Enzyme design. Structure first.
Site, mmCIF file in Angstrom:
data_model
loop_
_atom_site.group_PDB
_atom_site.id
_atom_site.type_symbol
_atom_site.label_atom_id
_atom_site.label_comp_id
_atom_site.label_asym_id
_atom_site.label_seq_id
_atom_site.Cartn_x
_atom_site.Cartn_y
_atom_site.Cartn_z
ATOM 1 N N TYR A 51 -52.917 -87.446 17.345
ATOM 2 C CA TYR A 51 -53.777 -86.630 17.961
ATOM 3 C C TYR A 51 -53.968 -87.368 19.536
ATOM 4 O O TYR A 51 -53.961 -88.734 19.544
ATOM 5 C CB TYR A 51 -55.351 -87.062 17.466
ATOM 6 C CG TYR A 51 -55.833 -86.113 16.398
ATOM 7 C CD1 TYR A 51 -57.108 -86.481 15.838
ATOM 8 C CD2 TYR A 51 -55.209 -84.824 16.039
ATOM 9 C CE1 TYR A 51 -57.337 -85.414 14.737
ATOM 10 C CE2 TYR A 51 -55.233 -84.333 14.934
ATOM 11 C CZ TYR A 51 -56.787 -84.423 14.376
ATOM 12 O OH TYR A 51 -57.122 -83.569 13.342
ATOM 13 N N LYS A 212 -72.501 -68.430 22.598
ATOM 14 C CA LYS A 212 -72.297 -68.791 24.077
ATOM 15 C C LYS A 212 -71.463 -67.591 24.650
ATOM 16 O O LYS A 212 -71.737 -67.507 26.012
ATOM 17 C CB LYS A 212 -71.816 -70.205 24.087
ATOM 18 C CG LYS A 212 -71.420 -70.531 25.532
ATOM 19 C CD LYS A 212 -70.855 -72.174 25.708
ATOM 20 C CE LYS A 212 -69.441 -72.145 25.101
ATOM 21 N NZ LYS A 212 -68.933 -73.399 24.744
ATOM 22 N N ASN A 273 -76.390 -81.208 17.755
ATOM 23 C CA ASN A 273 -75.547 -80.370 16.419
ATOM 24 C C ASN A 273 -75.833 -81.474 15.279
ATOM 25 O O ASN A 273 -75.839 -81.031 14.292
ATOM 26 C CB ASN A 273 -74.076 -80.558 16.963
ATOM 27 C CG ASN A 273 -73.761 -79.341 17.484
ATOM 28 O OD1 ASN A 273 -72.682 -79.032 17.955
ATOM 29 N ND2 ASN A 273 -74.692 -78.648 18.349
HETATM 30 N N1 NAP Z 1 -57.121 -81.455 9.228
HETATM 31 C C1 NAP Z 1 -57.076 -80.511 10.284
HETATM 32 O O1 NAP Z 1 -55.869 -79.919 10.062
HETATM 33 C C2 NAP Z 1 -57.623 -80.341 11.555
HETATM 34 C C3 NAP Z 1 -57.016 -79.581 12.510
HETATM 35 C C4 NAP Z 1 -57.931 -79.591 13.679
HETATM 36 C C5 NAP Z 1 -58.825 -80.335 13.914
HETATM 37 N N2 NAP Z 1 -59.358 -80.913 12.922
HETATM 38 C C6 NAP Z 1 -60.740 -81.908 13.277
HETATM 39 O O2 NAP Z 1 -61.496 -80.875 13.335
HETATM 40 C C7 NAP Z 1 -62.342 -81.026 14.800
HETATM 41 C C8 NAP Z 1 -62.483 -79.658 15.112
HETATM 42 O O3 NAP Z 1 -62.829 -79.872 16.552
HETATM 43 P P1 NAP Z 1 -62.825 -78.297 17.546
HETATM 44 O O4 NAP Z 1 -63.398 -78.543 18.863
HETATM 45 O O5 NAP Z 1 -61.309 -77.848 17.647
HETATM 46 O O6 NAP Z 1 -63.494 -77.167 16.846
HETATM 47 P P2 NAP Z 1 -65.000 -76.792 16.613
HETATM 48 O O7 NAP Z 1 -65.858 -78.320 16.218
HETATM 49 O O8 NAP Z 1 -65.140 -75.673 15.833
HETATM 50 O O9 NAP Z 1 -65.540 -76.585 18.169
HETATM 51 C C9 NAP Z 1 -66.320 -77.512 18.845
HETATM 52 C C10 NAP Z 1 -66.573 -76.890 20.540
HETATM 53 O O10 NAP Z 1 -67.455 -75.805 20.646
HETATM 54 C C11 NAP Z 1 -68.136 -76.241 21.749
HETATM 55 N N3 NAP Z 1 -69.711 -76.504 21.455
HETATM 56 C C12 NAP Z 1 -69.870 -77.125 20.176
HETATM 57 N N4 NAP Z 1 -71.260 -77.232 20.309
HETATM 58 C C13 NAP Z 1 -71.878 -76.785 21.470
HETATM 59 C C14 NAP Z 1 -73.159 -76.385 21.848
HETATM 60 N N5 NAP Z 1 -74.370 -76.952 21.323
HETATM 61 N N6 NAP Z 1 -73.404 -75.445 23.068
HETATM 62 C C15 NAP Z 1 -72.295 -75.146 23.578
HETATM 63 N N7 NAP Z 1 -70.869 -75.355 23.137
HETATM 64 C C16 NAP Z 1 -70.789 -76.116 22.014
HETATM 65 C C17 NAP Z 1 -67.504 -77.327 22.285
HETATM 66 O O11 NAP Z 1 -66.565 -76.790 23.402
HETATM 67 P P3 NAP Z 1 -66.992 -76.431 24.990
HETATM 68 O O12 NAP Z 1 -66.448 -77.252 25.870
HETATM 69 O O13 NAP Z 1 -66.541 -74.907 25.172
HETATM 70 O O14 NAP Z 1 -68.645 -76.366 24.952
HETATM 71 C C18 NAP Z 1 -66.834 -78.129 21.388
HETATM 72 O O15 NAP Z 1 -65.461 -78.522 21.950
HETATM 73 C C19 NAP Z 1 -61.395 -81.904 15.623
HETATM 74 O O16 NAP Z 1 -62.272 -82.740 16.475
HETATM 75 C C20 NAP Z 1 -60.662 -82.656 14.606
HETATM 76 O O17 NAP Z 1 -60.973 -84.079 14.361
HETATM 77 C C21 NAP Z 1 -58.712 -81.155 11.727
#
Ligand code: NAP
Ligand code: NAP
Ligand code: NAP
Ligand code: NAP
Lengths: 299, 299, 299, 299
Positions: A51, A212, A273
């Site tokens: 990461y 959103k 959240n």
């Molecule tokens: N094991 C694996 O294979 C794997 C793979 C990928 C990720 N992961 C993990 O899972 C996590 C996924 O994170 P992700 O950000 O890609 O997916 P997510 O948690 O589904 O998306 C979160 C995003 O949604 C928006 N958001 C969240 N709450 C909000 C609110 N109250 N109001 C407005 N917008 C909101 C934000 O972006 P805006 O900037 O648009 O507001 C935020 O960055 C990673 O950090 C990582 O640690 C694991």
């Protein structure tokens, strides 16, 4: 905050897990977001060697410095390419042994709580991998083992070898949301029998399930799903929740789930959240969610 | 460079392996030859405690200093006499335990990737040897175990104990070439079933298979074989290869082979010989090689 | 010097072993005697924590300092009282764990070659003892395990647990001489089946079998045995030996014997006694020894 | 002092054990009480991480500094809350691994002799707990394992896994006294079969069995029991004992008991109470004790 057992183990994780995947976010915004997670009572942090190429682990190590070790559950990964050549990736004894000390140094800790095999490696016999994990558990460098994006038969095989070698296999990390329910078919039922709990990613589907976006590209290029998501807003406000809090609570209604990962570099979103933790949704509301989303749900 | 799995393991070795056996070669020529191997994309290095009596390990350690550890596969040996008296040799717990730290210090590394029992020791019970390897794997000082010049029944016995004790037994080092095919009869078929790959030595038969000698002493004192080798030159040029590149490609056509060892203190030969990696030879050419060499081939 | 396998193991011991049991012998005479043993090609040294209360181990450590580690087989003991109270003795995990680092420090070494349970401890379950030895073998602090003054059934029990836990059980230390043959009945035959070799003490019966005493107290108070010993002198000179060399060779004729311990603070006796190593005695001479000694021999 | 085997093990404990549970007792009085215990020949000390929140372990470490390690049996505990959050308590790999180094530092020792699971943790699978104890025994940080306030079926399960993994399970700590005999029914008989000895607490029932209270609250609010205790005084003086010494001797008459814990911050009481060690009570006196106490005894 509310806490669950991570599979059949003595380990408790916060129901909301902070993930810091990285990129041009300034360090200072990453650090203040992790701080917001701590302030919201998040104990459990997900990251990976790969990461931001080591940056994610280093920033988490810095942000959590000073927090008593017993108050934190640190989850990191091995398997994705972090060096050059064919031994700079995968799940070989060589790559795992050459990876773990880097993760400990960057996280500034003596042991990783949960160490996740990031993607199944068909070239590594699972006897090779699990004996490497045994050596790291004996050495006190990792406590518990997890897996991400593994075929169910390989999860079962690993759990069996783990039980024989005294390696706790307690964690699986699927993609899981109101829209993405692929893991309900086989992964979660199998994991529950094996004593493995889910720590779920893309729970907000990268912001699509915050409500959103009015009429990631998979659903963004569909005004049908975006319109159906907007219609969860009354259902959410009915329950005194944001659409974001409803989507996170929805994942946590599954008894096979230990935690839901949130990403966000906004302090206010992290705190809001995090309040999803512990929320029961009425049977009535869960039937009305499936009706509104209908055939946009992936099984 | 092209890479193969070393037996049934997550470890990848370069198809061309650099061996630095030593003697009056100046250090500076050894160091620049190892450097030439690195420049040719060789990742995998073979040596032994006994080679130039510790000098081989020390020079390799110096030449590879600074190369990221994950980019290197270091292979060394134990079993040949390195001290005085009957405990200064062989495969006893005593000799192996008193050998490994010397090899780590001279190679300047925390772990040996492949540690090869150099010649079978009839005085050491294999339970004694394999439990010593288990202790070194637990301690993180060696990752994988190999064998050289072992009876096939002892390889099988070691592989069985290894599987039970979580010691990966993945490597065998035979003499193998277009002229020396003894290992085809029993060694390679047995090793393939046991999940063991060959890293082959005398692949150029000490220069006899470069086509350089016109009408080691075993074949040099025979103008018949030297004449038959000269006649591979048209077959080689037909394929856009040197006789040396053809001999090395020939070894690598065997699917039981992980790597072919090259020795050379000439930078140009190292770079040229390394280009053998990945070359497929046509069925037609392999039949014409056996015809030209005829009864000079040892089975 | 001649060398034997210590039981079924890769370990070679000198056929003559130097023991430094202590007392008013000046340090300087102990040190020069150990030096005489080294000069005679003795590799194998026997001592104990309890001997001169730690003085024996400290003097051996000093005398052998500088000798390459691979050239020495260091044997020491645990079980005799070395501290106050009921945990300052015996074979408990507690006493063994609290003993081994003291022996390593005084011997100035990283590992003991042979670590001997000095007298069977009926209060310690052998599962407790052998798992403690397993932990020390894993840690690289001891290589091989021995026993002294054990009932044969307990030797058998320990050897079985050792084989299961990967603890080599290779050494037994009986009283054995031309006059004391108790171990021939059960101990040596049982030990040979279990892959255990004898390192024998009182081989000269404290000087009685040097022929030095003309007409320990057990035989000294008997002019019959002392007269019969004097009559071995012609038999010895017939073979070009001293009576001392004949007594030591006699012990070494037993194929169940790995080594014979000599004590002596006289440089000339050490060098002379060491020359017993490798001597075959004729069948004729062995029949004439039994005739001369007759009923003075203990079975 | 008299000594017993702690279960089926090579470990000897003093029959009188000093416990330093803490609070406004000055450090200086705690230290002089531990010193009084040493002067009375007490070798065996009971404490816990949680006691005075780390203060108990720190004061014991200070008081016992300088005592040869082999003369002391240090018993401490893990399981009670010592940190914030759900991983700051219980018997998880995480909490045990994050607890042991703190206890070693505060006790100023390399190893804990007896490390007691303080209350059964239904959230931790016993395979998780016992493999954590295995890792600590391998590492030499703990020697022996104990349990306190466990259901008998869980003691049996732990003892079975311990035997398989080479973890000695030798100690159980019940409440046991002339008045509290609950453990006689199932706990002591089961423990005796499993090779586990009792180290007993509340042996004086917090001073009620010293005869000091004339007509804890459970019995103090009953003038019947207090009157019946006063009537043991003639029986005690008959045997040349205080009522306190009689109560302690009574516990030690049980052959399932290894030791009786005394608390006291009075030097004179510690010395007097320690003299209970080794006292046989006549069958006649044991029948007259049951008569006097009658139905006040809890079974
Ligand atoms: N094991 C694996 O294979 C794997 C793979 C990928 C990720 N992961 C993990 O899972 C996590 C996924 O994170 P992700 O950000 O890609 O997916 P997510 O948690 O589904 O998306 C979160 C995003 O949604 C928006 N958001 C969240 N709450 C909000 C609110 N109250 N109001 C407005 N917008 C909101 C934000 O972006 P805006 O900037 O648009 O507001 C935020 O960055 C990673 O950090 C990582 O640690 C694991
Ligand atoms: N496991 C074991 O028991 C064992 C035993 C022995 C060796 N080994 C390993 O295997 C290796 C064998 O090395 P080796 O040199 O004895 O055998 P080799 O690789 O069969 O012979 C290589 C030699 O052939 C000549 N040559 C190579 N390429 C050439 C070219 N393009 N043009 C002209 N001449 C060329 C060179 O000598 P010139 O100076 O004549 O050009 C070179 O030194 C050792 O380095 C060692 O690591 C292992
Ligand atoms: N495992 C066990 O339970 C155990 C128990 C005891 C001992 N041990 C070991 O075995 C060893 C036994 O030593 P030990 O001395 O008691 O028994 P020993 O070896 O039977 O007796 C040797 C003694 O005989 C005399 N001697 C030897 N060679 C001579 C010669 N050429 N000419 C004249 N006199 C000679 C010397 O005493 P003078 O001064 O009279 O010449 C010498 O001290 C100890 O050092 C110890 O390491 C083991
Ligand atoms: N494993 C567990 O769950 C557990 C739980 C609790 C405790 N423990 C252990 O067991 C120990 C129990 O200690 P405790 O003090 O609570 O119970 P106790 O030993 O039954 O009570 C001892 C108390 O009785 C009084 N006393 C003793 N001897 C006397 C004498 N000769 N004359 C007059 N008074 C006398 C003293 O208080 P006065 O000040 O009134 O004289 C003393 O503090 C603790 O220290 C701890 O280590 C274990």
């Amino acid at each position: 905050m509310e806490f669950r057992s991570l599979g059949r183990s003595g380990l408790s994780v916060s129901e909301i897990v902070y993930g810091n995947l990285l990129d041009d976010t300034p360090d200072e915004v990453v650090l203040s977001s992790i701080r917001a997670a701590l302030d919201a009572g998040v104990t459990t942090f997900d990251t990976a060697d790969v990461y931001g190429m080591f940056r994610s682990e280093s920033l988490l190590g810095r942000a959590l410095a000073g927090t008593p070790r017993e108050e934190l559950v640190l989850c990191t990964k091995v398997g994705m390419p972090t060096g050059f050549g064919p031994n700079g990736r995968g799940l070989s004894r060589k790559h795992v042994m050459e990876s773990v000390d880097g993760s400990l140094r960057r996280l500034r800790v003596d042991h990783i709580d949960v160490y996740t095999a990031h993607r199944y490696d068909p070239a590594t016999p699972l006897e090779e991998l699990m004996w490497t994990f045994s050596d790291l558990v004996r050495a006190g460098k990792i406590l518990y083992v997890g897996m991400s994006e593994w075929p169910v038969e390989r999860i079962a095989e690993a759990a069996g070898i783990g039980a024989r070698l005294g390696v706790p296999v307690i964690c699986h990390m699927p993609r899981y949301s109101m829209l993405w329910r692929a893991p309900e078919a086989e992964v979660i039922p199998a994991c529950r029998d094996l004593g493995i709990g889910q720590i779920c990613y893309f729970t907000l589907e990268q912001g699509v399930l915050t409500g959103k976006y009015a009429p990631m590209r998979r659903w963004l290029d569909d005004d049908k799903v975006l319109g159906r998501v907007e219609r969860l807003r009354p259902l959410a406000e009915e329950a005194g929740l944001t659409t974001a809090q409803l989507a996170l609570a929805w994942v946590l209604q599954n008894p096979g789930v230990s935690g839901a990962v949130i990403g966000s570099f906004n302090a206010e979103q992290v705190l809001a959240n995090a309040e999803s933790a512990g929320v029961r949704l009425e049977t009535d509301l869960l039937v009305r969610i499936d009706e509104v989303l209908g055939d946009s749900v992936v099984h």
